[model samples]
Target: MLTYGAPFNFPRWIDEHAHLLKPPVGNRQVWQDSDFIVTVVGGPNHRTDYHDDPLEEFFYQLRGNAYLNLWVDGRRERADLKEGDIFLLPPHVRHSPQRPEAGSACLVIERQRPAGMLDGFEWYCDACGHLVHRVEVQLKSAVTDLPPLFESFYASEDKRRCPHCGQVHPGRAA
Candidate 1:
């Protein structure tokens, strides 16, 4: 069994790119092939982007609160998640992460078959007022490769909306 603490070391592969992260960017403690990745997330309330996946992911809060604005299947929904709150995203799901006003830190556990496979996505940050476009790249990949073809596999044909929240962001909602 492994017990982790806060303010830990960042992932070795993400070290150089660490500068790109905002404050409170949680350090990833363990990311194995056992179909799960456990990490700590820290940063001020900024719009974290979304991704496409054909598997499942669960974000279990272990620290602070997060105002999750999910766009599920094109509909928008809101979930005020605090510590111990578990958010699940099934296969081909599109979802974004929103921080609180003050800021927060939490633990995210990502689970999937053929683990670590992800999709590309677009984002709009209400906090920064910037439309961020995320390039769909592979997991444990080099920082210079082009993203995979996510739209073909995920919700490319349908205008996926969020059922939980009432927003129409694109792709699948959380």
Candidate 2:
């Protein structure tokens, strides 16, 4: 059940909630409304899959610095986020957030995904910045629902190799 948040009706979006999440964030739900949903993600988030969400997304770096990878214009780009940095991405922009250090967290706010709107998770080639593979899903909870999908991609050579450049994607050390 959703209840009013304590202490100010708005709980600490990051610090207080970070304890409830891990690198994969588990089944945590911080706040939810008709259209407003807030999520506090603990890191390092070893995910290489990019999110192709259909709504605008908000990101605020809460702890250590992080890297946001973007797939745009048929190539890959990057947006670096230091502590306290805020970025608002428009709809349909594919993004992957990477945090390399422990004790790192981020606050992300997005709307409830419409039913039947499938979210796409994509892996891009590291060497040539071309797409390797993508998986589409109707997300129920992105924080907890994506790990298995990412795991399958990392475990398979065919899925990691770029179809365009023949370069294999390397899994992260973490």
Candidate 3:
């Protein structure tokens, strides 16, 4: 666990995995106790692996925007969530949330239970192409970097023309 900021009085179990979470504007409760587990994550742009937990989870946007690319049961859809938007994620579903810019914050709530293999973490969107280990090292210009995004776009093997505007990586072997 990567704890960026943790309270001194936090319980030992939480303290052990403390990492910094971006707090909402004028609010500091990143994670709080509930019947389920709550976590707040903050960063500029974040690329997440698909994860499936046994318990249901919810995400509430506190600040900034995030692009949610969800691959649920082998189908893909993308949605944009802004401040005050709430997202409910059910169990055994693959979910990937990415922040397109810096200063993004979200509060995540889910039931806390025994840990299990996180899905989607290992999933590489063929459309998204190979995952870049770090965004800082890679330049993601909407106009400047057409080839890479195009390659990834082509790679997705979606088979249909995109009704929306964007690029896709080339497809990969299953």
Candidate 4:
């Protein structure tokens, strides 16, 4: 948050981005650079990117039901968040938000990572669950920076190929 930048059109009873988000539009950043990297993400986002960030993430289910898939202690887990539910994910917990219900939405907030702090994403083989690909990104803007990284990883067949077992992840997300 701006140290003294207030008393402007900066805030309101509710944020407008929450209403502006939809399936195709996907998500909108609440602020360019603030204390929190708040994002209004829309539903049917069956994407896969197990994010392992340095800071913890908070989720508020604004619409329909959703699941947060996690990879911890060499195992998988899930958090079922219904409408009006809230969940706080611990830092460095590899988590993937699964919001498959159409028109569903959630408000996710994370502490703005410091400059040069690299955010890690892992794409495990869909078939054998072996490590498939990994990328460390400096997240300047989640809305603008994340899409291309997913696309690039999915576009490559080698990246999706399992090293342990020879199985390829579908060209795109399942």
Candidate 5:
């Protein structure tokens, strides 16, 4: 737990707790309160779904390189993030984070979800670029909920295939 208005060593804290992140792919929760939350993320694999969140998101690259693949206002765009780069994402935008095989890491900050708000995971078609599948749910806790969703999606071939164009996206290796 981090105290408000207290001086804290940033680099040393990350060095100590980064390895405790589960599966090491951008899903570590560092601190949280009623207003916001912070996370440290790193991984070698790319996320297949574009996340749609109700709150704004802030990202700061800690090491290596990252790519923010975003679909905003019906337009697809890619933003390259190197070490020390910071990006602020608007609310309700669809975005995915990708990292190279050698891996990259970042710090993420986002406002806590308000009541009745939900988060979504959307997968688009690879060939014709159509909506494939989407799962919308309340993110009560990342630790308990996220991994199951990933496992369910990657385990079923039906979930990975695009219904519009019949394109098959490869699932995460078991």
Candidate 6:
């Protein structure tokens, strides 16, 4: 069984396993306890919809920069993150990151959800600003579970089409 509480070598770990990061956001969980999950992620080039998490998220930039595009108060906002910069996001905020520069990585720490709290991934209509689809995530492991959800979404034209606006989102396969 995997246990937490040891110091990690973020740079070395990312160096060794950089090739394995899967799509949407190329993320790998480095640690997990009852309290928190620590992840190192590479940004993707596409603009997907915002993710609304049940717990607050903390981010530390490791290399290059990250751009967090947010949906706040019915408007869009951006937060530019440079190397060594840290950001803390409040819970239930709708947000996603733009593609980082090549070789960029970030350390993200988020609290584990309590019982009955589920993580969510949502896509809004680009044309009409209506919610097109949502996936309630039961996060078992980032390595195994997340890539499939992304793959499924991109594979189905039915899921990408917005009923409210009749617009089809551009889908990318993993």
Judged by lDDT, which candidate is best? 4
Writing each residue's lDDT as its tens digit, candidate 4 over 65-126 gives 88988887888888898998998888899988888786677888897788888999888777
- Which regions of candidate 6 fall more than 4 Å away from where they truly are? 1-10, 13-25, 32-34, 43-47
Per-candidate local distance difference test: 0.51, 0.74, 0.49, 0.78, 0.77, 0.76
TM-score of 3: 0.50
lDDT of 4 at 140: 76
Q: Report the C-alpha lDDT of model 6 over 7-52, residue by residue, as the tens digit.
A: 7776788988676443544777775555678787775455585788
True-vs-predicted CA distance for residue 133, candidate 2, Å: 0.5
Task: Report the alpha-carbon TM-score of model 4 versus the true structure.
Answer: 0.85
Q: Compute the lDDT of residue 128 as modeled in candidate 4.
A: 74
Model 5 residue 19 CA deviation in Å: 1.9
Per-residue lDDT of candidate 5, residues 47-109 (tens digit)? 777899988999998877888889977888898888889999998889988876354568888
> Best to worst by TM-score, what's the order?
4, 5, 6, 2, 1, 3
Q: What is the TM-score of each predicted model, taking all chains together?
A: 0.53, 0.80, 0.50, 0.85, 0.84, 0.82
Clash-forming residue pairs, model 2: none
TM-score, candidate 5, is 0.84
Q: List the residue pairs that clash in candidate 6.
A: none
**Per-residue lDDT of 49-81 in model 2, one digit per residue for the tens?**
788988899988777788888877876789998
**How would you encode candidate 1's per-residue C-alpha lDDT over 45-145 as one tens digit per residue?**
44445556556766765556776666665566676778668777676666666755332455666654354565556554333433334455555531223
Among residues 3 or more apart in sequence or in different chains, the pairs in candidate 4 whose N, CA or C atoms overlap within 3 Å are 1-35
lDDT of 6 at 6: 72
